[PDB]
Amino acid sequence: ANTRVIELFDEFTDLIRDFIVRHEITTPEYETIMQYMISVGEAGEWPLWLDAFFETTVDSVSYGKGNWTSSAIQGPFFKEGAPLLTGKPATLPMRADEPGDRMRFTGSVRDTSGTPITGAVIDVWHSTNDGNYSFFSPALPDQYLLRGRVVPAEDGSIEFHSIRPVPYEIPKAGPTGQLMNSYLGRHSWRPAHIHIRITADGYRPLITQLYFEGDPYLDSDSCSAVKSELVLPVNKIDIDGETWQLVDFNFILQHN
Amino acid sequence: ANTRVIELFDEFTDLIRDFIVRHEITTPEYETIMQYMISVGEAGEWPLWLDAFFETTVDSVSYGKGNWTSSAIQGPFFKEGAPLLTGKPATLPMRADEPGDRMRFTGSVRDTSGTPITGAVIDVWHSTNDGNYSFFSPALPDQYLLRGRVVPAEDGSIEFHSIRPVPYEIPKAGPTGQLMNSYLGRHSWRPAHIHIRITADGYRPLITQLYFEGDPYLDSDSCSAVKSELVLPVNKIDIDGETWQLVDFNFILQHN
Ligand SMILES: [Fe+3]
Ligand SMILES: [Fe+3]
């Protein structure tokens, strides 16, 4: 037996019991909740659901602000063992004629002392323009698509190419989408974001997200996950008769 | 109900986040909760889990005490369309030599004033000596056994014969059982009971349970479903060879 489980679970049951009483939850309402919970399980949506509403809060208490990069939620759509990307301009694996604007990402990884962290590896994943993640949609293959690991240069600089992510919506038709859209009368949209994980021997891992200035949902995240210090200027500076979105970010990691 | 799910959900959301913050639920803890929630779904256990922990409460909101017969939790094991019995001794359907002590039940269905409610139909269901309900066990036929419907005599009184229900265990190896037995370090035993549902034209439906004096689990019910007003004096008679156990209860109902 776990005293953690005992202390937390006994309190949690008193809490929910008080809620039931306080709000006068009826037998039908209880059945609806019982049935709704079941359908989340049947839709495979527990990760998506809990992350949509609560991962922000678990994120808030776990990691702090300071002179390092702020973390943000991981969400449910991360995947391990993404391919190391090297070459000319290192580029995220992409379908032929992947919809979207070519995006060029630059920046660095350093420590709270300004030292470049050459040991780091940066996982990056993001949605297709369709608002889908590889491995997590029936409309996409279970293959590393718009996912990959990127490594800094000896000087600490990083650089990759992809399509610029655009906003997306949690399936309106799933139990999560239903709750957010019908039942609550809100939306199920997230602002556009690049997910990031950086790990380096000696440093605390960083899981974070990079957002874009002017994004329509910047102040309306259905998942409650945006943070001002992770909102990025976008530049557009043509390369031979081709317009590129330019995004730059310098990551600072904490020791230990 | 758009407006009503908005109130409860937002309130629920604040409740859980506040819980997450105060107890500082970590990423690993959160992932464990998430895994457990999936567990319960992959078993057929949401109804069993919710009824075990929270139906006691939904119950005490739906009915409330008085000179009524005090209600009780239904549980996940009720079956609609049980057989209407009219034998002269009047017996629940059971297999030949159904193990366990024989039991005779008597009582009444009167209203508050004491006028017998002739239009009553009473569903009664309970476990085998082995701790299984028909329809909910491979060791039992998917047929009505220890399940039945009884109609009162025109003076109110009711009688049926059966076997004595005994304390049963919610399965040790299930996510719920695991929670009750392993992580919480308690037990998953319910005290002995007979389930009862009463319907009457122009009267409020009553769902409840009858327990037995002396039961080892009367004060440690795994489902917190016991009410002292609903535990029965049990007179133990030995009609040689076969030891009958006689019980009596007078059901009072509310009415529109
Ligand atoms: Fe995302
Ligand atoms: Fe039972």
UniProtKB/Swiss-Prot annotation, chains A, B:
Enzyme class: oxidoreductase
Keywords attached to this entry: Aromatic hydrocarbons catabolism, Dioxygenase, Iron, Metal-binding, Oxidoreductase
One of the GO biological process terms: catabolic process
Gene Ontology MF terms in the entry: catechol 1,2-dioxygenase activity; ferric iron binding
Gene3D superfamilies listed in its UniProt record: Aromatic compound dioxygenase
Cofactors named for this entry: Fe(3+)
Residues the record lists as binding Fe cation: 133, 168, 193, 195
Entry's family note: Belongs to the intradiol ring-cleavage dioxygenase family.
Name the UniProt record assigns to this protein: Chlorocatechol 1,2-dioxygenase
Source species: Rhodococcus opacus (Nocardia opaca)
Gene field: clcA
